[PDB]
């Protein structure tokens, strides 16, 4: 578990691309499991940025 920008929800998958997938958290091409995510703007954002 972790937090990302919503634009990066695209990157968390087997065989995917870009700076999160390549450089922060990598899934194998034969992953066996589930990916789950939810918007957390009301929890994790702050009026001065978090």
């Amino acid at each position: 578990s972790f937090v990302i920008r919503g634009d990066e929800v695209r990157q968390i998958a087997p065989g995917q691309t870009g700076k999160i997938a390549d450089y922060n958290y990598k899934l194998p091409d034969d992953f066996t499991g589930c990916v789950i995510a939810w918007n957390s703007n009301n929890l994790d954002s702050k009026v001065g940025g978090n």
């Binding site: 634009d7 990066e8 695209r10 990157q11 691309t17 870009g18 700076k19």
Partner: protein
């Protein structure tokens, strides 16, 4: 979009990694090529519309 812009690109170093890192693009979809390969693959011509 009735009369779209066009350019033939030739004779250049095409580092797509700037565009690949700029994932702020709402979509970046490829057909017949995986986008990862574009810095290792190369071409006679490219056309940008």
């Amino acid at each position: 979009v009735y009369a779209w812009n066009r350019k033939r690109i030739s004779n250049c170093v095409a580092d797509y990694s700037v565009l690949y890192n700029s994932a702020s693009f709402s979509t970046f979809k490829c057909y017949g090529v995986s986008p990862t390969k574009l810095n290792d693959l190369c071409f006679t011509n490219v056309y940008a519309d």
